[PDB]
Design a protein around this ligand. Structure first.
Ligand SMILES: Cc1cc(NC(=O)[C@H](c2ccccc2)N2CCCc3ccccc32)no1
Lengths: 157, 129, 36
């Protein structure tokens, strides 16, 4: 029975859906902490959000430190050749910066709330990757991808 | 009262379906029927597009409220404010203004992307039908 | 004589330019969905 639970929890489909449910949990909790206030110290669900981001940073760190090249700069470079992974690093750094601005007193609470207001924009646009798996949403995402370039040249015009 | 009041409401919900019941019959005419089947395929295409619409428009809605009214206590009307007011955001308009600027230009480019995506989808759907 | 004239020229120009740019978006984005 223990082997059955172990085989179920190491299947990639289970890891996918199980990460996705925790990610939906993240999005609802982070919605709650951005619509409702902040205080001198963070609320409990905001601390949950901070632990999400911190352990995500640690996971990205071992993604750096368990790649196939053996020279560390090559590990960092190959890890930074994927666009979504680059913006993941960028977002973790602004969310940390927003944390340091949030912990410092007024007028820094407002700027921390601004940074956490930009983070919900990025952490809903992160969903397009995962979406690119469903048989109907994937071509839609790829159209948005090419429409970036086409709409960009239309912005110049 | 008040049972007659919401009974009339349930009747007024029923009127919707008692007109949509006409699509079946509209399927005998040589020109109405392919159109009805276009509603038929466009419903699933629109459903997946509503998934995309929630992912993009809801980030803009929550971002607007977060950058807007900061002094609203826990209530279920906040969920109403995050897709009621940005549904009528056309009525609306330090770095300071820079943050809403990013939000505003993101709203315009997002509206352009999704609306033209939707017209492209519904135009491609015409081919198979 | 020039009180209304050149506002009308500018408004008509903005209207026609807005139309051709919007349908430019329409046609270019109809092509993109075909390839993908
Ligand atoms: C905080 C935070 C973010 C997050 N989710 C992800 O950012 C992402 C993901 C996205 C959608 C569904 C499931 C997971 N994810 C989590 C773990 C690291 C990683 C590696 C490659 C691809 C995705 C991925 N969970 O908490």
């Amino acid at each position: 029975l223990g082997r059955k639970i172990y085989e179920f929890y190491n299947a990639p489909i289970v890891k996918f859906w199980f990460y996705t449910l925790a990610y939906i949990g993240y999005l609802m909790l982070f919605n709650y902490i951005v619509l409702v206030k902040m205080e001198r110290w963070p609320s409990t669900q905001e601390w949950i959000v901070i632990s999400y981001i911190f352990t995500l940073g640690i996971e990205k760190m071992r993604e750096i430190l368990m790649s196939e090249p053996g020279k560390l700069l090559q590990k960092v470079k190959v890890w930074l050749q994927e666009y979504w992974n680059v913006t993941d690093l960028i977002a973790i750094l602004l969310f940390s910066v927003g944390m340091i601005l949030r912990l410092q007193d007024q007028p820094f609470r407002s700027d921390g709330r601004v940074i956490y207001c930009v983070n919900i924009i990025y952490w809903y646009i992160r969903l397009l990757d995962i979406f690119g798996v469903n048989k109907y949403l994937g071509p839609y995402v790829m159209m948005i991808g090419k429409m970036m370039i086409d709409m960009m040249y239309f912005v110049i015009i | 009262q008040p049972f007659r009041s919401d009974g009339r409401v349930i009747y007024c919900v029923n009127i919707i379906y008692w007109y949509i019941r006409l699509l079946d019959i509209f399927g005998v005419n040589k020109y109405l029927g392919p159109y009805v089947m276009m509603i038929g395929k466009m419903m699933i295409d629109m459903m997946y597009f509503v998934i995309i619409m929630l992912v993009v428009l809801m980030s803009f809605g929550v971002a607007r409220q977060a950058i807007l009214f900061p002094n609203e206590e826990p209530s279920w009307k906040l969920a109403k404010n995050i897709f009621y007011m940005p549904y009528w955001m056309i009525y609306g308009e330090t770095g300071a203004w820079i943050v809403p600027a990013i939000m505003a230009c993101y709203l315009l480019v997002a509206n352009i992307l999704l609306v033209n995506l939707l017209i492209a989808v519904f135009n491609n759907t015409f081919f198979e039908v």
